[PDB]
Ligand binder design. Sequence first.
Ligand SMILES: COc1cc(NC(C)=O)c(OC)cc1Cl
Lengths: 412, 412
Amino acid sequence: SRRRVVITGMGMLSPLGLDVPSSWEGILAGRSGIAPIEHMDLSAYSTRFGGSVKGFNVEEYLSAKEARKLDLFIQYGLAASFQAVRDSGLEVTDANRERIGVSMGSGIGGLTNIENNCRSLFEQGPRRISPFFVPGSIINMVSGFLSIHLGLQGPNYALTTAQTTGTHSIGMAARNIAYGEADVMVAGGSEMAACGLGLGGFGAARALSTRNDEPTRASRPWDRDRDGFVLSDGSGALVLEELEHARARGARIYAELVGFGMSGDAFHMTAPPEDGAGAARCMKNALRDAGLDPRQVDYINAHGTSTPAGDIAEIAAVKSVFGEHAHALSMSSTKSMTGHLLGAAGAVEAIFSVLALRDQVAPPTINLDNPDEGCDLDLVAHEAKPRKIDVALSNSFGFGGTNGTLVFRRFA
Amino acid sequence: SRRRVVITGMGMLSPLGLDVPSSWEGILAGRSGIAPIEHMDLSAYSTRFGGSVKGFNVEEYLSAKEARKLDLFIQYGLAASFQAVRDSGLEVTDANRERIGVSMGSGIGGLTNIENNCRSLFEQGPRRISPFFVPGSIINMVSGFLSIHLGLQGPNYALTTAQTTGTHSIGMAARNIAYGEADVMVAGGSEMAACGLGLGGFGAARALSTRNDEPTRASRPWDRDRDGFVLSDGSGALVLEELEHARARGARIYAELVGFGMSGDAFHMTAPPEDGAGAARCMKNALRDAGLDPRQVDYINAHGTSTPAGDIAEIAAVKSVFGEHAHALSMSSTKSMTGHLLGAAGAVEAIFSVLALRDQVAPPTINLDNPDEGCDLDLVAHEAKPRKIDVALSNSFGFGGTNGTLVFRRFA
Ligand SMILES: COc1cc(NC(C)=O)c(OC)cc1Cl
């Protein structure tokens, strides 16, 4: 029968910090992680800024010889995973290694490495493609490399559901544990899409904010002057653990994962429906899965991408699901500070939702100067709001009409 | 307790044919789908052959305009998916659309689109990148487009586990049904990694057969003269359905999906361990999941890639798991004929495993002229073998040491 699942470890690289505490300190201070991109020349591009990981030292985790063969999204995914496992205190042994698995996902994976090898191929030839091109670029290799470094022999897979990846990865990993396929999973996502093809491709879709002259103000979810998402890099990982397993070893438990929802919109390849019908269906699935009264929800970490259609669809969905209680909960978009980590967004935002529960505080939506028509909920504008949070919900929505909702609650 | 899951529809593109029955006729005749790759200058490449899909007409499925937005691997996955849904006879309605989902995956995703867009970026700059580059290249867009086209509102996701993708996709979709998260799932995988980038990337690792003079003899699993795998394109999709749901509408049931195993080797990024320990755990997990004794297995569709270390690891794993029964079962690699469809390998091989059950015939391992040291199992050399098959396994053992096993049983 279905077992309970708790969070015993977390790890992160974000535009606000090289770990969880430093990132969360930025979140509660209303700090922006967005700046002009330094790592490549973007003068020909319509967007020249984003959320970079600043000062990442891969040699805190991996030998230089190894790191040189891995795309940044793998390096970030391993860093976050190693943090989360260390934070959990779990010791991997012959007795438990078959019961510990990994599901770390990515929306796009090793696009920087694929781009650089494509340049080698076209300008020089196939003899100059790296021998490490495939295992250093394809999405399942965060799970793969992590399992080989720690000796994890449990379920080993990766999701790729665009901007929903981190949320799906955590939810499905929790189902693995619930149904008895594993006792422990490391789950989350990682992304580094800030190369020519990523910035150029989202640019060609006119999906990105073009506020080049004021990057910290670009990401402004539900603000009437928003003009698209801000592309950001990094990784989140959580250690999910069966409750009795965690109790037996005296684990520190941050929160319980009580609910997971998925739904497809079946609407449009990239656009969310205006009424947020798929998002509402997904949240309702998650709340029923958690055995909750919707009035129990205290805090929602929105998807909150700073796109015109996405932000207003999320208000519509929250009003449809929560009715008058929509006016009592707090909802914020931490993408106002971090930007959109794409396949890692749901992973870092699950961590922020768990820390909202630990610290009893709703993070702010910065830059919400002039809320748009109908955006009249408590969106925690400008400043962090201390408040009672027993139940927190993290939402994600992606290309393909793919929706995920996680429901966390305090554990006693 | 758990619901039963049956297969009611199948769909395929392969190097042998543009549907299931044409592909299967090739399989049972021992035909090769491997040939020199056309309409590419492969002069500088060390491998110039593979398994292409021949004569695919996307306008049987999509308008030319929708087809122009999507990478070939998405086109292939939608073709297999539409075939599978047609073959199932399922009628999607407002009463069931929330109970029908999709999990179609890919190992490497949109290499052809990445190449074409890199050509534009490098030559002309980012403003020549296609607006549809991102949504038309990301791996979850088979699930996305299929859900939008057919109005499917159930779980919508995509796995990417390299060469194990199609097996994991099918197994995890079966779990969704068994545990009541869906009543119907379309599951499988698709791949189009000819392109320069696949042939170049695998070639850089010297992972490919270089038998350019005799492409049809290149893929020779367990043969002492094998010299690596053959890269191939296509797609496989199955309609998985809860048993009572299938019976209530009078569905044609091909077979029952009774078991699913996963494991991680935790050994090496690309090579399996010599004794196939992870593959053995995975098959034992899949049999335990099915409540079957190893002695009940009749037929194994091997991963059987024609890499020296992979093929011998599988023999060791099968000897370990099956002991005194290891010679009684028949095990064949259909990759001897199809080549290696990477993320679609497990999907087309699940279909071939189901058809082995329907037709009571083990497909051949062609090219098995001189079995290597210790390769002394019933590997169905050269010619198909009619035999009793009640229980068929399909194995996939991919990069990152990620393993999958599906167990199918005759249904009556
Ligand atoms: C991909 O390159 C490497 C990988 C590992 N380690 C693993 C677990 O894969 C390594 O450990 C000494 C050294 C190198 Cl160079």
